[PDB]
Design goal:
The PDB classes it as dna binding protein/dna. Keywords: DNA damage repair, DNA BINDING PROTEIN-DNA complex. It forms a tetrameric assembly. The complex is a heterodimer. By secondary structure, chain A is an alpha+beta fold. Chain A folds into 4 domains: 296 residues, Transglutaminase-like (Coagulation Factor XIII, Chain A, domain 2, Alpha-Beta Complex), CATH 3.90.260.10; 51 residues, Anthopleurin-A; 33 residues, Wheat Germ Agglutinin (Isolectin 2), domain 1 (2-Layer Sandwich); 63 residues, Rad4, beta-hairpin domain BHD3 (Alpha-Beta Plaits, 2-Layer Sandwich), CATH 3.30.70. Chain A has a 6-stranded antiparallel beta sheet. Chain A has a 4-stranded mixed beta sheet with strand order 17-19-20-18, with helices on one face. In chain A, strands 9-12-11 form a 3-stranded antiparallel beta sheet, with no helix packed on it. Classes of the chains: A alpha+beta, B mainly alpha. Chain A binds a DNA duplex through loops.
DNA sequence: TTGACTCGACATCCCGCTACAA
DNA sequence: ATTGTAGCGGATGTCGAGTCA
């Protein structure tokens, strides 16, 4: 009955790790490639590809009465450049194998079993001759635009293996595999319009179009077959000056529902790790353009709204179904649903969507005490009914200060309960160490065992005594 | 702490042959277990390391 | 075409006392 | 004898598969 195609949590955690590892590698490859693009030797040769007429078209004069017409001229320039690049790029290869498209966990495992060293010269020579796969082709096109002094980002859709794929056997359909894989590009270009203050999307090699993305993009894969090998999750923009920015929100129609489920950024550790990576790769400092962009993203983030299906309201950042409200949460007084969802596949069946910012988290008395807070019905399991209280019913707990002799106030068991810094007396400190208790007892100074989690993890002693304890622990072998 | 032969193969794959990333990453991650918890704690270090080389 | 629903086996979060042995 | 030592998880969530409208 059950062929049970599911793996162990061990494999789960490994896949998550390898996903991070592959992503980081991808993003480094981008950074380096973006370097190779800035190559000064290349620009000077590439300049002669562009007639003065086209160059002038690329830098039109400000038109004060109607800025649009300047943008209009700019667009014509970009199209003529794309044309001569079609002309510059003679022989366009096939991706060897799957190129930089996403590989399957199975493909990886098996890739161990079964490469032209390239480096920087070979890239340059290729781009100058016009020989390479579509990735090189695009990269060259961005180089060219850059050699003309336009602010031209290289965009990369990173396709690491999917770490939410829990399956043991992960097998793909063979039909039209390559044509469906190449239906949308892995690399492309963005360009900053100073007149309209927006980034223009450009795909000169694969789809050969130019778009001003608002809510929909021709480049974002659609249907199911095209999305197996191209799964849009991390769209990274590198600019001339070694900026690095996550622009996913531009290209994802449902970023906060659909896409957020497939990025590492859905839990908090993830978000913080990703930001660490962006900062590692972001070597310039914030410009005003960054702000025009952030405002666009904010507005996009507020225009997504309730999704059109129930599955998209699981673990949504802003939105939650009435039915997914935990037993221990309540609705903040005088708030209500922010929206409705027509439920696909039952006539008239509708669900209540609340904004998550209108939901309050409740905790019992002990639970608060364990966060260092004290006070200014449900079913538990013997049978008991447990009352829960909100965060604003409560107040920090300030524990009594230690005496002159450094005496600490203890509990019935002769310890002091320290589950949170608040619960350390003001004049005291917590020292967590298997021997901290051995130490303090050996010195026979006044202390109190710290319960940090019947687990005695350490000591609470007066601050004047700190230097002494730190020394005694260090000498524990001699006690 | 990593060898210089692996950092060499890695600088070269990452820079000029990313098609071959997949199997190399299988290999190297299998030869340096601690790399896991490293990558989780301090990615920006590993970055800078790959940039110098 | 797609989403809703159910079901299978994992996780994840949150919540010392009796008896024997040398 | 007596002290040291050793033996006994529910509400909720996630994803895969299969099924239905």
């Amino acid at each position: 009955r059950t062929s049970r195609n599911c793996s162990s949590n061990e494999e789960r955690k490994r896949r998550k790790y390898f996903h991070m590892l592959y992503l980081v590698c991808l993003m480094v490859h981008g950074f380096i490639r973006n370097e190779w693009i800035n190559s000064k030797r290349l620009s000077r040769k590439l300049s002669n590809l562009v007639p003065e007429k086209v160059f002038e078209l690329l830098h039109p004069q400000k038109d004060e009465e109607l800025p649009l017409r300047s943008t209009r001229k700019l667009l014509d320039g970009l199209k003529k450049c794309m044309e001569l690049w079609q002309k510059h790029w003679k022989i366009t290869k096939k991706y060897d194998n799957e190129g930089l498209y996403m590989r399957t966990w199975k493909e990886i495992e098996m890739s161990a079993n079964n490469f032209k060293t390239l480096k920087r010269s070979d890239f340059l020579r290729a781009v100058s001759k016009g020989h390479g796969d579509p990735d090189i082709s695009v990269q060259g096109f961005v180089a060219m635009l850059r050699a003309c002094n336009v602010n031209a980002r290289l965009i990369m859709s990173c396709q690491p293996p999917d770490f939410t794929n829990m399956k043991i056997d992960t097998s793909l359909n063979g039909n039209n595999a390559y044509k469906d894989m190449v239906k949308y590009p892995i690399f492309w270009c963005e360009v900053w319009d100073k007149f309209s203050k927006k980034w223009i999307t450009v795909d000169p090699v694969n789809l050969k179009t130019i778009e001003q993305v608002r809510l929909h993009s021709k480049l974002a894969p659609k249907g199911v077959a095209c999305c197996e090998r191209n799964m849009l999750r991390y769209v990274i923009a590198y600019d001339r000056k070694y900026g690095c920015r996550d622009v996913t929100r531009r290209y994802a129609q449902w970023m906060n529902s659909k896409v957020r489920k497939r990025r590492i950024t859905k839990d908090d550790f993830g978000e913080k790790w990703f930001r660490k990576v962006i900062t590692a790769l972001h070597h310039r400092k914030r410009t005003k353009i960054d702000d025009y962009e952030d405002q666009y993203f904010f507005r996009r983030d507020e225009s997504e709204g309730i999704p059109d299906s129930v599955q998209d309201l699981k673990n949504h950042p802003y939105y939650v179904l009435e039915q997914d409200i935990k037993q221990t949460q309540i609705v903040k007084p005088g708030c209500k649903e922010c929206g409705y969802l027509k439920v696909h596949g039952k006539v008239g069946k509708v669900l209540k969507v609340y904004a998550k910012r209108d939901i309050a988290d409740l905790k019992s008395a002990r639970q608060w005490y364990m966060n260092g807070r004290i006070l200014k019905v449900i079913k538990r399991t013997e049978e008991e009914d447990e009352r829960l209280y909100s965060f604003e019913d409560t107040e920090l707990y300030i524990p009594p200060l230690a005496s002159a002799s450094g005496e600490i106030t203890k509990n019935t068991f002769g310890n002091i309960e320290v589950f949170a810094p608040t619960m350390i007396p003001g004049n005291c400190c917590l020292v967590e160490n298997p021997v901290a208790i051995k130490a303090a007892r050996f010195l026979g100074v006044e202390f109190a065992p710290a319960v940090t989690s019947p687990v005695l993890s350490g000591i609470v002693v007066a601050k004047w005594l700190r230097e002494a304890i730190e020394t005694a622990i260090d000498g524990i072998e001699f006690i | 702490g990593l060898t210089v032969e692996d950092l060499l193969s890695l600088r070269q794959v990452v820079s000029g042959n990313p098609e071959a990333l997949a199997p190399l990453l299988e290999n190297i991650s299998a030869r340096y277990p601690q790399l896991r918890e490293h990558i989780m704690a301090n990615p920006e270090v590993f970055v800078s390391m790959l940039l110098e080389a």
